[PDB]
């Protein structure tokens, strides 16, 4: 896994 799930809230 990568850190996309961690950083997803920053893109909303």
């Amino acid at each position, epitope marked *: *896994e*990568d*850190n*996309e799930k*961690l*950083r997803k809230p*920053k893109h*909303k």
Partner: antibody
Amino acid sequence: QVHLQQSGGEVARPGASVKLSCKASGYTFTGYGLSWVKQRTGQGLEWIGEIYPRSGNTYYNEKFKGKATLTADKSSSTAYMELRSLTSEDSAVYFCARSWGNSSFVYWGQGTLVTVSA
Amino acid sequence: SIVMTQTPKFLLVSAGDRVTITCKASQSVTNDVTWYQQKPGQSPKLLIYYASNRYTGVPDRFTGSGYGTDFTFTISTVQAEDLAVYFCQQDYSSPFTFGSGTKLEIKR
């Protein structure tokens, strides 16, 4: 031992495209999002977009949609940014920067200078 | 998007002086503000993250603080080698936005 090695400076013609590269070493390439950042010399820094090499998923700054396309090649641990329809405003230094945790730009490449000119 | 207003735009100080840089966000960004040092020729170097935490190997003379909209960056005693442009950046939400930078210059 994270290292991001960017391609050398280039001239490119107005209206043409140019593809910059960012070769990653010292970590698992698919582990982290990787962004590109534009700097005009002596001026500010602008986030262009981010790509996650595990999935290929991309997120763009709205201002660079239609200008920049981010890709990645797992086999060579290389990130690419292609700039299209080049204009004088695209001449700048471009950095790649790698994320860590939820933080965007922790490890930085050395930068690539693009000069748009015939 | 969120605008980071960085002041002052330049500093002219003597070695050993204290310097404080200020960054104000157009809306709350909690504590997710990063401070970078960019020396001539180089890429930006991360010094402070989450407003107040020193990155690994950053000297003790660099500090930051702030929560919400007002953030400061402090060099307690400026050294000759600290000549650089310093940038704040909000990492709270996309598009991630930087301040315009502060050029630190030395008088001797």
